[PDB]
């Protein structure tokens, strides 16, 4: 009986065998976007994607990630509201059985057809095990996903999904490059949080895009096809693998805009 995103292991009960799930900086959280301070003292982001070695795409039983090789120092993020240096690990996606739900942040309450996210850790704790268990450990990069046109650089992920429909399946996935992901505008909003997933460590500084990229309605159709069960077992389709938005409690949420 362990967690997932059904009724009766979802969210609601993650905080049974995780307590931290009520602690006091849990994410996601809605972004109010009237109460977000502009900080000018907030820099541009640094992402810097260039030499990333995409490796393998994994189904988790949860959701896919991309992985990358972080063993040396490329697919950096730094900068913004940052000390130090994040170094690229995974990106993974959050989406909705339907197309007004599937972001696990929302602006204004708004909920966005699914979210991706890109986790670096601080290359100051050595490796991700040991940075997840720091307050500064962990730097997400999340971009909200509409549908619309479809995202060309995107459709690389797309196209290996059907060989990896099942939990614990993955596949070879080279060269793959995350700038094809990645908003025009870098503006963003920045809190301290946490994992959304079990173990909901908090160890996260969250930098939010505040532009999304649109992705085709058959984009987002193929993740749905993904399963949350293993082969052979009866079919779970992998959809609404979102947490909702958690109490914001004493935290303040900064812009680095307008
Ligand atoms: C740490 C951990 C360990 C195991 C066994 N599974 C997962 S599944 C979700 C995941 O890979 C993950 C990893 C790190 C981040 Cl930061 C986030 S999220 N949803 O907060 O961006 C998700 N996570
Ligand atoms: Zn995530």
Redesign the pocket.
């Known amino acids: 009986h362990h967690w997932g995103y059904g009724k009766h292991n979802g969210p609601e009960h993650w905080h049974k065998d995780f307590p931290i799930a009520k602690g006091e900086r849990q994410?996601?959280v809605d972004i109010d976007t009237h109460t977000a301070k502009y900080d000018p003292s907030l820099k541009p982001l640094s992402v810097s994607y260039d030499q990333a070695t995409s490796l393998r795409i994994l189904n988790?039983g949860?959701?896919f990630?991309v992985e990358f090789d972080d063993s040396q120092d490329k697919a950096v993020l730094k900068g913004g509201p940052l000390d130090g240096t994040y170094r690229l690990?995974?990106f993974?996606f959050?989406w909705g059985s339907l197309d007004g739900q599937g972001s696990?942040h929302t602006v204004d309450k708004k909920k966005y057809a699914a979210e991706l996210?890109?986790?670096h850790w601080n290359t100051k704790y050595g490796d991700?095990g040991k940075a997840?268990q720091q307050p500064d450990g962990?730097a997400?990069l999340?971009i909200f996903l509409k549908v619309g046109s479809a995202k060309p650089g995107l459709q690389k992920v797309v196209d290996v999904l059907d060989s990896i429909k099942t939990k614990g399946k993955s596949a070879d996935f080279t060269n793959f490059d995350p700038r094809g992901l990645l908003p025009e505008s870098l503006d963003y909003w920045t809190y301290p949080?946490?994992?959304?997933?079990?173990?909901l460590?908090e160890?996260?500084t969250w930098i939010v895009l505040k532009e999304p990229i649109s992705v085709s309605s058959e984009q987002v159709l193929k993740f749905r096809k993904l399963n949350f069960n293993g082969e052979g077992e009866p079919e779970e389709l992998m959809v609404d693998n979102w947490?909702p938005a958690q109490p914001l409690k004493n935290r303040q949420i900064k812009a680095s805009f307008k």
């Open positions: 994410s996601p988790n949860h959701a990630n690990i995974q993974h959050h696990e996210h890109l986790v991700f997840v962990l997400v999340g949080g946490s994992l959304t997933t079990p173990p460590l160890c996260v947490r």
